[PDB]
Design a protein around this ligand. Structure first.
Ligand code: HEM
Length: 153
């Protein structure tokens, strides 16, 4: 539900993420886990990470962060017409990983926080608003797919 101008601002700051996907992904997950400690309970692989230093050293955390942002990038680049990319994610997140829409809100927050911390100059008022909207569109379409699949939106 974004304008063309809004999608442009989204893809322009996403260009910064594409210059270092894994570093941004790492920071996103660390911000998610430190901010909302309960999210860490969905990851049986990361149950032994007892501090930010342990999270920073984990090669599997950094690879997962890379996987997450690569996928989200794929979705953002479709500017709304992302059904084919969104479906498999909604399927796996509603069924196997058991990820509530609320945790999608927490990771959306962490994405924004990381963009703001790393690119303060490039992530101004207009780019922040546009990115909020894009993440909201993503959460809303994930939620609608979850409901169609028989789960809580
Ligand atoms: C921007 C939002 C997110 C995106 C784009 C995303 C993307 C992905 C992708 C691409 C995978 C691997 C393929 C698959 O299984 O579907 C994955 C796996 C996973 N995701 Fe998500 N994810 C997101 C948010 C979350 C959140 C918020 C959580 C938990 C709080 C989560 C938990 C997991 C888990 C537990 C796995 C499997 C990990 C493993 O192999 O041990 N994801 N995610």
């Amino acid at each position: 539900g974004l304008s063309d101008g809004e999608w442009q601002l989204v893809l322009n700051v996403w260009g910064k993420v594409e210059a270092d996907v894994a570093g941004h992904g790492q920071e996103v997950l660390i911000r998610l886990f430190k901010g909302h400690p309960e999210t860490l309970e969905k990851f049986d692989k990361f149950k032994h990470l007892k501090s930010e230093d342990e999270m920073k050293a984990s090669e599997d955390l950094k690879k997962h962060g890379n996987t997450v942002l690569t996928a989200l990038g794929g979705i953002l680049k479709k500017k709304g017409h992302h059904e084919a990319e969104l479906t498999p994610l909604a399927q796996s997140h509603a069924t196997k990983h058991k990820i509530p829409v609320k945790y999608l809100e927490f990771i959306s927050e962490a994405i924004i926080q990381v963009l703001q911390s790393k690119h303060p100059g490039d992530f101004g008022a207009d780019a922040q608003g546009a990115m909020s909207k894009a993440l909201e569109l993503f959460r809303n379409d994930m939620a609608a797919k979850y409901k169609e699949l028989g789960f809580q939106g």
